[PDB]
């Protein structure tokens, strides 16, 4: 817990070489269960059987390593993403008389990694308006921001009045 948290995206993707088995995790992670691995869009299981992977480097500031049991084919897509839960199950006593550096660093670092996972999703996997566009600066104005549920064969379309986004059916 007495480690630094570097500014690194909590998601990495690789195009495997022929027979490659080792893939680097460039971001810190505190537990093996808090890392998700995909190969060609199929989530893998941690283990020793063929079609599974082993993982090391938990707690290291520089990340760890993913080792596939079965060597990957050429141009296989390997995706690694951190997925730590957002909670707090270890708390201090009411009147502590010993506060360790690891405990204090642990609480601050843990929340930084949580925020980095949220920001990695919104920076790489989500849509947004360009920061300079003239979106309404009052959040209560939901004209450009609130979406309706789509029915079958429907798309999002700003209505004729330009007052909100509505579901619109296309049968072409």
């Amino acid at each position: 817990s007495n480690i630094k948290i570097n500014d690194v995206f909590q998601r990495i993707q690789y195009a495997a070489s022929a027979g490659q088995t080792q893939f680097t995790i460039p971001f810190p992670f505190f537990d093996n269960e808090y890392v998700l691995v995909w190969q060609n869009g199929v989530q893998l299981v941690m283990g020793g059987a063929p079609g599974q992977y082993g993982i090391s480097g938990a707690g290291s500031p520089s990340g760890g390593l993913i080792t596939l049991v079965t060597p990957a084919a050429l141009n296989d897509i390997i995706t690694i993403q951190g997925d730590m839960p957002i909670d707090r199950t270890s708390i201090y006593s009411a009147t502590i008389s010993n506060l360790t550096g690891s405990d204090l660093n642990g609480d601050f670092n843990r929340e930084v990694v949580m925020m980095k996972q949220i920001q990695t999703t919104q920076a790489l996997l989500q849509l947004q308006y360009a920061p300079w566009l003239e979106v309404s600066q009052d959040p209560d104005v939901t004209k450009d921001r609130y979406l309706p549920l789509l029915g079958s064969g429907q798309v999002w379309r700003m209505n004729d009045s330009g007052t909100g986004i509505e579901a619109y059916t296309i049968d072409e």
Partner: protein
């Protein structure tokens, strides 16, 4: 009118019937509650000493059969070398149908000495008389034994104590022998070896070694041929050979257990009390004559020859008053004190008595019945438990009165006194206290701090996660014998301490503890009669399984919901493994400690410090509600030997070491309990549950720790006393604007008006280096309690987790309306 008042705790806990006694000088020197704390003689209140686990009492000669009956264990201390600090804790325990002596030194079992001369059912009636270098084992029906240490800690021998010459007694004087006042005794000669003949059957085999006195002469009987003929050796010459029965004196041996050798004798028994006083051995309270003591020959402890009637010879003292005066305790204080069933016998210490026959002046000093618990000597006074065991009596000589004065030492603290069953003394090193300790039937322990010349006398009550059964000690050290529960896994032995039924609002309380505890055929009770009804269950120790027998199962699934009560007073749902399938079939309900992670002792409707679980029926429609016959939990009783220590702040502690994962093993005596861990630097790092296998996980890894159970100190000061000019404000409306807590060398304090208390910090932000343990703190903390306006409102000083604690006073700023 705003008044500043203060309160110290020199008088301990005061009985509630004293709360209108503002005329006494004790109103600002006492406490409403003083629990798991003691009163120092400076007036401060210190957390009570903790205990260290030593061993579990087992029948070592029968495959370590666990002993679960407290009447089968009785310990005592024996100091062998005071300067080398060698004191043995000897435990008399059941060994089959007989007894054995377990000898402990340096918290280690040294050796075991067995004995077939005693029954396991006689253990509680065995008393000792510790000499300078040996211990005598006394029972009214068993000949005196001697336990003596050899050349090492593990070398001990138990032999029979054989007097050189037995004491003699004429039992016909108390009507316990044949009356010979009308007989005639004929002697063959007046000197040398003679034959004594009686006109009627008088002699028994116990007369061998007895004495015959008449006509100025004395003869020692050496053989008894029949009931009318005996052989004797003349010690002092007779003046004639014809002795009238009414002018003679025939005495048999005072101690004997032989009732079969012809002619048959009575079972006179053996002494059950004793003490070594100066150069004599005093033994008394035999089976046949309970109101008589015998002093040995001066300088010869094992000789009780009483043929002579002058000088340094052995002699007897008989205690009589109005009724029974059976000797309870022989006290080596001043000129010897005798506590009896009725009256206390002693002689004035001002009188110069050399303790010899015909120069002894024991008189009935005062009426004070005493029990068989041995009297304690401490702080220039004698303390002994009364005969009904509901009071502790203090005896001191008063020159102004010319006699010993007895008064209740529990005079101001009668409310906390149950029935007392043992006592001891302790004078701990480095602590400003002189302690008298006494365990009770209810499982608590009384603590009495006394400094009599300084008017210091404070009682307090000690409780543990278990039941105190005995306290041992003569001042140098203190041990306790404690009955505790452990988790026994898949087996079930104990019953729940509390059980209630409740309505959907969880306000009704219908006590059903007896029905759950009783066997199914003795009592049963219907439960969960309506939707959203509750079953509330509590226990002193944590449990992880229930075993339920139904006299009538539920007709359909009750859809049970389980919750447990955590340390914040919050009920949290958990999912057990329910093998009754909603009370539809007999079976068990089990859960793991991870399901009840936050479980902690708490209070529910004036019942304090229990582990609570509630079960709620969610089923809308069940035609036949279940009827429960008996509920058992997976805990069992054990009996432990523990040593008290002022360096410990937890109970039943043990030093352990955690591995790289924080795992700790070897805590089997604490299986199923909630324990705290304290580092060597003196920081409490948290609590955890020990599982049934004796393993638990702690926060600090690769660390040496002390692990034990919390006993929570509580200090409730006396009611506010701020006399104004209008008069005593004993019943006026009062409000506390400021509460000052004055503490020395303390950690983890919290104070205020319940339920919302204020924690007292012990960490200086800006002057603390991470990783270090801040030492115990001293200072004054000011708190706004936010209490009510009642004349008798309670403020509490307590501790959130185990640690050092000393409260030297409590101050207030009171708005007296």
């Amino acid at each position: 009118p705003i008044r500043s008042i203060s309160n110290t705790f020199n008088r301990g806990e005061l009985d509630p019937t004293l709360f209108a006694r503002d005329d006494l000088d004790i109103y600002d020197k006492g406490a409403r509650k003083l629990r798991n704390m003691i009163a120092l003689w400076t007036g401060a209140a210190r957390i009570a000493p903790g205990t260290i686990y030593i061993d579990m009492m087992v029948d070592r000669e029968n495959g370590n059969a666990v002993i679960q009956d407290p009447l089968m264990v009785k310990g005592f201390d024996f100091t062998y070398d005071a300067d080398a600090e060698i004191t043995y804790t000897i435990i008399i325990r059941k060994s089959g149908t007989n007894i054995a002596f377990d000898i402990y030194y340096a918290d280690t079992l040294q050796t075991t000495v067995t004995s077939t001369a005693y029954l396991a059912t006689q253990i509680q009636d065995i008393h000792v008389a510790a000499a300078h270098d040996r211990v005598l084992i006394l029972h009214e029906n068993v000949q005196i034994r001697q336990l003596k240490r050899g050349a090492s800690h593990s070398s001990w021998s138990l032999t029979t104590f054989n007097p050189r010459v037995y004491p003699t007694y004429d039992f016909s004087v108390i009507g316990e022998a044949i009356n010979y006042q009308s007989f005639t005794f004929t002697l063959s000669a007046t000197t040398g070896s003679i034959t004594i003949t009686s006109s009627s059957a008088v002699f028994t085999h116990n007369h061998v070694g007895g004495l015959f006195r008449s006509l100025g002469g004395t003869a020692r009987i050496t053989a008894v041929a029949s009931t009318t003929s005996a052989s004797a050796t003349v010690l002092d010459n007779f003046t004639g050979t014809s002795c009238a029965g009414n002018l003679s004196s025939l005495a048999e041996k005072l101690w004997n257990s032989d009732t079969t050798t012809a002619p048959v004798s009575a079972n006179r028994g053996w002494p059950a009390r004793g003490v070594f006083y100066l150069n004599r051995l005093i033994l008394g309270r035999s089976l046949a004559v309970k109101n008589l003591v015998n002093l040995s020959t001066a300088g010869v402890y094992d000789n009780f020859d009483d043929a002579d009637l002058d000088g340094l010879v052995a002699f007897s003292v008989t205690f009589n008053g109005k009724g029974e005066q059976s000797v309870q305790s022989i006290v080596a204080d001043d000129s010897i004190l005798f506590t009896t069933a009725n009256k206390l016998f002693a002689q004035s210490p001002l009188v110069e008595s050399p303790i010899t026959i015909n120069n002894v002046y024991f008189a009935p000093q005062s009426q004070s019945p005493a029990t068989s618990i041995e009297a304690a000597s401490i702080d220039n006074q004698t303390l002994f438990v009364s005969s009904d065991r509901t009071k502790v009596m203090q005896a001191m000589y008063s020159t102004a009165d010319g006699k010993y004065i007895t008064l209740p030492a529990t005079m101001l603290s009668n409310s906390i006194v149950d029935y007392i069953n043992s006592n001891g003394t302790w004078e701990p090193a480095g602590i400003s206290t002189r302690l008298y300790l006494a365990t009770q039937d209810n499982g608590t322990m009384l603590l009495y701090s006394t400094l009599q010349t300084q008017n210091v006398a404070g009682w307090s009550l000690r409780t543990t996660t278990g039941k105190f059964r005995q306290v041992i000690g003569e001042g140098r050290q203190s041990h306790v014998i404690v009955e505790r529960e452990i988790n026994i896994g898949a087996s079930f032995e104990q019953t729940l301490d509390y059980a209630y039924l409740s309505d959907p609002t969880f306000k009704a309380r219908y006590d059903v503890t007896e029905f759950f505890a009783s066997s199914p055929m003795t009592s049963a009770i219907g439960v969960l009669e309506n939707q959203n009804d509750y079953i509330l269950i509590g226990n002193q120790a944590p449990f992880t399984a229930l075993d339920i027998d139904f006299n009538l199962v539920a007709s359909s699934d009750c859809q049970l919901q389980f919750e447990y009560l955590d340390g914040n007073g919050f009920w949290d749902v958990f999912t057990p493994t329910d093998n009754t399938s909603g009370f539809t079939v007999d079976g068990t309900i089990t859960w793991t400690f991870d399901d009840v992670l936050n479980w902690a002792p708490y209070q529910v409707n004036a019942i304090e410090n229990q582990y609570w679980i509630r079960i709620k029926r969610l089923a809308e429609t069940v035609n036949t509600a279940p009827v429960i016959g008996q509920v058992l939990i997976n805990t069992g009783n054990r009996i432990y030997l523990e040593r008290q220590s002022f360096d410990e702040y937890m109970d039943s502690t043990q030093i352990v070491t955690s591995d790289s994962n924080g795992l700790v093993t070897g805590l089997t005596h604490l299986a199923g309990q909630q324990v705290y861990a304290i580092t060597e630097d003196g920081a409490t790092i948290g609590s955890s549950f020990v599982d049934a296998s004796g393993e638990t996980s702690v926060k600090n890894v690769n660390t040496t720790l002390t692990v034990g159970m919390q006993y929570k100190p509580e200090l409730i000061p006396m009611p506010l006393y701020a006399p104004t000019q209008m008069g005593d404000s004993l019943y006026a409306e009062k409000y506390v604007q400021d509460l000052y807590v004055d503490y020395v060398d303390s950690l983890y304090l919290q104070a205020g008006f319940r339920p919302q208390l204020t924690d007292i910090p012990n960490m200086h932000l800006g002057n603390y280096t991470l990783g270090q343990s801040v030492p115990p703190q001293t200072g004054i903390y000011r708190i706004c309690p936010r209490g009510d306006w009642e004349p008798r409102q309670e403020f509490v000083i307590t501790q959130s987790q185990p640690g050092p604690m000393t409260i030297i006073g409590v101050g207030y700023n009171v708005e007296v309306a």
